[PDB]
Structures are given as structure tokens and as C-alpha cells.
């Protein structure tokens, strides 16, 4: 792809410090500021039930792969203009790789 396997352990700790404030990834986990992310890979953006997404995410209609996810995480608003996800992004590909590596495993 254009994504390379990283540290799942490293990714688990980046999640906890960079995403946990607004998201859950476990199956049966509640939506919080942001939607529960279990089952996110292979889904289109804005389709979790019982969550209120912006018109923008839904319409963007992104199919989520390790690779799209990377571009998103780099600069979210730059990738989906009008998204309400208030995260600046992950500039370093290495942090992104470890985080995606983690996400691919815990959201399965």
C-alpha cells in the first residue's frame, strides 16, 4: 500500500493519548464526542448508527482503509473540509503507521 506495519504497542499508547479523549474502539463501546470506531476499516465515513455526523463527513463518502485513514489523520479538516473532528493531526508517518497498526487490530 503506502502504509507499513508499525508498533501495535506503540499505536495503543498513541490512541490513548491522542484519540481516547473522544473515541472508543471496542465492540460495544459508546459513542462519545466522536463515534465508537469498532468495525471502521472497510466502512464508508458517517455510517455508525446513533451518531450525529456533519453533512461533510457523510458526503465525503470515504471508504476507510489503512491508507485513507493515514491521509485523514495527517490533517483531518484539510482532508474533509467542514468536519467537526477537532484534531490537528499526526504529521509523522511513523506515528501514523503505529496508530493505524493498532487500530486495524483493536477495531476488528
Q: Which residues bind ligand HEC (CB under 6 A)?
A: 18-19, 21-23, 33-35, 37, 40, 45-46, 48, 53-54, 56-57, 73, 83-87, 90, 99
Identify which of residues 2 and 99 has a Cβ nearer to ligand HEC in the complex.
99
22 is in an annotated binding site: yes
Euclidean distance between CA atoms 76 and 9, whole angstroms: 24
DSSP single-letter state for residue 91:
-
69 is in an annotated binding site: no
Euclidean distance between CA atoms 104 and 31, whole angstroms: 19
Closest distance between ligand HEC and the C-beta of residue 93, in Å?
A: 13
Euclidean distance between CA atoms 78 and 90, whole angstroms: 12
Identify which of residues 4 and 86 has a Cβ nearer to ligand HEC in the complex.
86
85 is in an annotated binding site: yes
How many other C-beta atoms can be found within 10 angstroms of the C-beta atom of residue 27? 11
Provide the β-strand partners of residue 44. Answer: 63
Annotated binding-site members for heme c:
19, 22-23, 85
Amino acid at each position: 500500500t503506502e502504509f507499513k506495519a508499525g508498533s501495535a504497542k506503540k499505536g495503543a499508547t498513541l490512541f490513548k493519548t491522542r484519540c481516547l479523549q473522544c473515541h472508543t474502539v471496542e465492540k460495544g463501546g459508546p459513542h462519545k464526542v466522536g463515534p465508537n470506531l469498532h468495525g471502521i476499516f472497510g466502512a464508508h465515513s458517517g455510517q455508525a448508527e446513533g451518531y450525529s455526523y456533519t453533512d461533510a463527513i457523510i458526503k465525503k463518502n470515504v471508504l476507510w482503509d489503512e491508507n485513507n485513514m493515514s491521509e485523514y489523520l495527517t490533517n483531518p479538516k484539510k482532508y474533509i473540509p467542514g468536519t467537526k473532528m477537532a484534531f490537528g493531526g499526526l504529521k509523522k508517518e511513523k506515528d501514523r503507521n503505529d496508530l493505524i497498526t493498532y487500530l486495524k487490530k483493536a477495531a476488528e
